[PDB]
Design a protein around this nucleic acid. Structure first.
Lengths: 62, 82, 97, 101, 86, 101, 97, 62
DNA sequence: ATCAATATCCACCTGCAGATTCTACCAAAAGTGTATTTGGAAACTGCTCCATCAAAAGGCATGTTCAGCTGAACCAGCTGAACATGCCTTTTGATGAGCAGTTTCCAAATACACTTTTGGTAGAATCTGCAGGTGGATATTGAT
DNA sequence: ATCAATATCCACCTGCAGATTCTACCAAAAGTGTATTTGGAAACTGCTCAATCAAAAGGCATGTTCAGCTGGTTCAGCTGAACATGCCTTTTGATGGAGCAGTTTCCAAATACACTTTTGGTAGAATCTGCAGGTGGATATTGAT
């Protein structure tokens, strides 16, 4: 179910493993179940810590 | 010329992996340490794998041996059978 | 002409998928993933059931033991809903013999 | 235009982050990894052969492990008010997980 | 009067006891905010283990939690305990 | 002698380190721990009873766990060029072990 | 007059202790520790052997399987020495029937 | 054997759990085997990180 | 640097809490003999794996250049250790039912032999979503 | 704000590697019946759990000090991301051609199982001694004038 939801979100009609990883890591409980499990061809979630980006003061400064 | 073959794990590939891990900036010294760490992991796995391999009196390493050896180290793997 | 036979849970997963999202497919690799997942959970639950039985010196694995193992392994609400489905299944099976 | 267009340091790294995080293909080339596995396995037992899918499975495991390691390392680095990861960070994370070596 | 001893709860796990515990880990200097967080952490740990123990207890139709249940519940979390049977 | 003898900050902590590391007796008192366990158990199931040795076993497990956690905490602290542990260190250690909550 | 019977590994540990350090004793708690330790290692090894057997569709657990599991679970030199003792034990047992 | 050696080091003729813990953590391989095991009444090894001990310049300074 | 303070080590002394040794006896372990698997040798085959060639080709080795990073002095202030005190919690010993742990026994539960279907699966024969391609609209970036 | 250069995202197309569906069929599921075992409701019983009051032991909440730790500021290096270039390890793709995975036979070895006979492991009653505790005296580590 979660996979199909992500699938519709990316406009793809066929489930691929990427979707499964996206489903698992976005639900807390499943992530707990599979916290030490690697899904092949899965990758990880997009996530950058806020601190290492550049500051939002990137605009007119005069 | 070949270079102990660990150097096949090149700098830019490691940089790419670190990019997947959320890393933005990498020191020059990381590479050697990473290589060593990688080696250790592989060694352990393959040892166990080969042990399973030796038990069946086979000469061909199969995926299942790797999967089991991975399972026993607490890094269970999905997507290659069993 | 010699030929083997490897079983899997593929077809049942396919049925479930069509039940939940009729206009949707799934690739082979993901089907393999689901196969591995099912086998892993099966192994954990049965192993835990066995350990519970052996600790209480009972030689029969019943529905009770499975239910307990489920409450042990899975967290909270997932367990509750699952247990409810299982109880419903037992209640349907036992009646309509 | 006279001078070459030049992005500031860090931006292209971020571009690499988003690009590789969107996709899933393996990052390391097959053949060197095959040679690595073959060398190490030879030192334990001789004349071993490997199925392709086993090599792929090791590749997946290795890359997932490294990714997780770099993640914890980066957290350790941020904790020290730095942005650059260094070997002691990796040693720290590995020492905490119990992956001693 | 209002005692309810300090909360009738975890707050009986007094500060200097946590200090002694940190001393066992080799630590020298502790901040004032540590205590509460540690308590919460402790609770979570206990919660999980006790839950499992009680569940084992529930399977045998007993009203007494035995040591064995604690051992097994700890074993499933990868914190096996020796010296109390099993 | 006029003024009270006074040790410098840190020394007595070190003395406590050596004294408690050399011994093994439990540091937390039985009764509060008993009451804590009893309260939490009451919220899951009512009128339960507890054998004494079960309480002792929980005590041992908890203290060992906390000791390990403070150890990793102290390492993370040292990593940031500090000597004072802080909550974020504990959060870092627990997050790395996967003991999320 | 009713009386049960609980087995342990105590007496054997005591024998070994007197073999290695004649002028030394051991407390009850530590003997319990050793008892639990023995039980844990026994369980791990048997389970691992079982898993190997089940993976190779062999229904018999033999010395070979135990040897394999030992090499898997334990590290390095400990494995080698223990394996040596095991092989010596089998060679002695099989001869002097 | 390791326990009895530690015992002779502490001038006690009887093995107690403390000694077992000392034996286990001081052998690399046993520590690997039992890295996630808690010995009751075991305690831990004496170990203070070098950095939080005071500087050796604690003497005449004039 | 040397002197007092205090903590801690170390020699010596005593009685008791587990440590250690001695009975009976019964669940447990070895021996015969038989019934029943079962795993390794031998004979075959076809799948998969391994050493080569070649044409790109995307990627890797190297070399510049500079904007952001990593530390290293320095200092305000804060915050948490040392210590004293009184006080408050905790400890520990007074000689009833509840529940863990057995023992019976049989009504329910379930393994095992055999036959009858039948759903699952390998392989042939269709489908099609999506990997590639092409083109154009913004969206970031970055200098000015 | 305002303007050039690339990077990312939408729109529209098209053919094929992978997905889905259609056969044949053969190793599992279900039925039936019968043999075997078992879990759970009654009868007991002996260890253990539940918590109060009084008297005493030891530790903690609090409040007073003050040494040195954190953490922000500033600054001198330095070194690691961008990006150009040229060449070269890898992709792909094909082909051969050896060797091993996996089947199928089969029978000499191995082991479960039903008894029978020994036996040592373990509960429980008599000894015992190492160590907890205690007394006292000598050295070690802190720290000040």
């Amino acid at each position: 179910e979660l996979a199909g939801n992500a699938a519709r979100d990316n406009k793809k009609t066929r489930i691929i493993p990427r979707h499964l990883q996206l489903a698992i890591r976005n639900d807390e409980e499943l992530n707990k179940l599979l916290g030490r499990v690697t899904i092949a061809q899965g990758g990880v979630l997009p996530n950058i810590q806020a601190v290492l980006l550049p500051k939002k003061t990137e605009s007119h400064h005069k | 010329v070949l270079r102990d073959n660990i150097q096949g794990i090149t700098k830019p590939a490691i940089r790419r992996l670190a990019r997947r891990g959320g890393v933005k900036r990498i020191s020059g010294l990381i590479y050697e340490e990473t290589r060593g760490v990688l080696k250790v992991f592989l060694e352990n796995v393959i040892r166990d794998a080969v042990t399973y391999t030796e038990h069946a009196k086979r000469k061909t390493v199969t995926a299942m041996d790797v999967v089991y050896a991975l399972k026993r180290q607490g890094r269970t793997l999905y997507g290659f059978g069993g | 002409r010699k030929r083997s036979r490897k079983e899997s849970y593929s077809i049942y997963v396919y049925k479930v998928l069509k039940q939940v999202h009729p206009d949707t497919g799934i690739s082979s690799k993901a089907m393999g993933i689901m196969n591995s997942f099912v086998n892993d959970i099966f192994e954990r639950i049965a192993g835990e059931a066995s350990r519970l039985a052996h600790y209480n010196k009972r030689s029969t694995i019943t529905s009770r033991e499975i239910q307990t193992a489920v409450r042990l392994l899975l967290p909270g609400e997932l367990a509750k809903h699952a247990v409810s489905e299982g109880t419903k299944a037992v209640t349907k099976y036992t009646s309509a013999k | 235009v006279k001078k070459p267009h030049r992005y500031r340091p860090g931006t292209v790294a971020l571009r690499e982050i988003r690009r590789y995080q969107k996709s899933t293909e393996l990052l390391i080339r097959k053949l060197p990894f095959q040679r690595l596995v073959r060398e190490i396995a030879q030192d334990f037992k001789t004349d071993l052969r490997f199925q392709s899918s086993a090599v792929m499975a090791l590749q997946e495991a290795c890359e997932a492990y490294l990714v997780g390691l770099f993640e914890d390392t980066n957290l350790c680095a941020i904790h020290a008010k730095r942005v650059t990861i260094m070997p002691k960070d990796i040693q720290l994370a590995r020492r905490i997980r119990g992956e001693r070596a």
